[PDB]
């Protein structure tokens, strides 16, 4: 048994920003990174031999979990050419060839892997050089990390993402930025609903779900005028923020899987951390959707509504 990278000829390999919604196996809002590679395998290659694939230092196979089990290399009919394991330390997949390389000759293959930008290493929008490898053969692509923009309607401005999924305890962590433009906002109500929500806060039932109620964990933090939030929408160190949770003890109400936080008149940004429970489908898949909205009142007394919605739907 031996490493046969040298016996792998790389025919094509491209790196591009893709849309997470198109990752059918694990669909979620936001952008991903797509590594598409094609190669032929020398006939001398045999079962138990190995080749490797290298991820860029700044990506991870999933940015919601550590279930880092890579997809098999398969032929067009889905027959398995090789099974892989991910090494987090080296950021490299080691693929082990099955008997397929013994049953067949002049084998060629295609592999498309999905990964995600490490939001801790890349907290803000920038351009960055990514480097992957098939069988030690490297390619590099410059991409631009776009992060999402807040949805803004008058003074209502809001955005959110999922940051962490725990399949064992069946919870999902969502981080919400309230008034990240640090506007002056009057009679601010923030809703968190265990359902999809459109850009104007209208709740859309049936398209995924979480449980939002009394027991849902909900921390709130106030941001200083001089602190700028990571455009990634993901906070890694809450110590640096003023924890104002207990001030919402008597400004929280629950009705039909929706939480309402009475923020009142405000002039700062806030962060909400929500850890909520979900229920997987009967077939064991995921169908998580959770949304938030900000309502403010403008100088003429009209309501303005801004909504934001995240999801995870697997297959």
Swiss-Prot record:
Subcellular location field: Secreted, Cell wall
Which sequence ranges are marked TM in the entry?
none
> Domain of life here?
Bacteria
**Which protein family is it in?**
Belongs to the serine-aspartate repeat-containing protein (SDr) family.
Q: What quaternary structure, including any partners, is listed in this protein's UniProt entry?
A: Interacts with host complement factor H/CFAH (via C-terminus). Interacts with host complement regulator C4BPA.
Query: What the protein does?
Result: Cell surface-associated calcium-binding protein which plays an important role in adhesion and pathogenesis. Contributes to the resistance to killing by innate immune components in blood and thus attenuates bacterial clearance by interacting with host complement factor H/CFAH and modulating its activity. Inhibits also bacterial opsonization and killing by interacting with host complement regulator C4BPA and thus inhibiting classical complement pathway activation.
Q: What is this protein called in UniProt? A: Serine-aspartate repeat-containing protein E
């Amino acid at each position: 048994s031996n490493n046969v990278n040298d016996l792998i000829t790389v025919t094509k390999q491209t790196i591009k920003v893709g849309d997470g919604k198109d990752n059918v196996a694990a669909a979620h809002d936001g952008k991903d990174i797509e590594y598409d590679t094609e190669f032929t395998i020398d006939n001398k290659v045999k079962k138990g031999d190995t080749m490797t694939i290298n991820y860029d230092k700044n990506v991870i196979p999933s940015d919601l979990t550590d279930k880092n089990d890579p997809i098999d290399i398969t032929d067009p009919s889905g027959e398995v050419i090789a099974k892989g394991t991910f090494d987090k330390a080296t950021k490299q997949i080691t693929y082990t060839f099955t008997d397929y390389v013994d049953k067949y000759e002049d084998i060629k293959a295609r592999l498309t892997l999905y990964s995600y930008i490490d939001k801790q290493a890349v907290p803000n929008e920038t351009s960055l050089n990514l480097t992957f490898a098939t069988a030690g053969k490297e390619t590099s692509q410059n991409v631009s990390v776009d992060y999402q923009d807040p949805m803004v309607h008058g003074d209502s401005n809001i955005q959110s993402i999922f940051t962490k999924l725990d399949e064992n305890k069946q919870t999902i962590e969502q981080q919400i930025y309230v008034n990240p433009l640090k506007k002056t906002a009057t009679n601010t109500k923030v809703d968190i609903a265990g359902s999809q929500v459109d850009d104007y806060g209208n709740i859309k039932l049936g398209n995924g779900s979480t449980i939002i109620d009394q027991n849902t964990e909900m921390k709130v933090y106030k941001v200083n005028p001089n602190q700028q939030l990571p455009q990634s929408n993901r906070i890694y160190d809450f110590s640096q923020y003023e924890d104002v949770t207990s001030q919402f003890d008597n400004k929280k109400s629950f009705s039909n899987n929706v939480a309402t936080l009475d923020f009142g008149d405000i002039n700062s940004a806030y962060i909400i951390k929500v850890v909520s429970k979900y229920t997987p489908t009967s077939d064991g898949e995921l169908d998580i959707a959770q949304g938030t909205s900000m309502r403010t009142t403008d100088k003429y007394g009209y309501y303005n509504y801004a909504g934001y919605s995240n999801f995870i739907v697997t297959s």
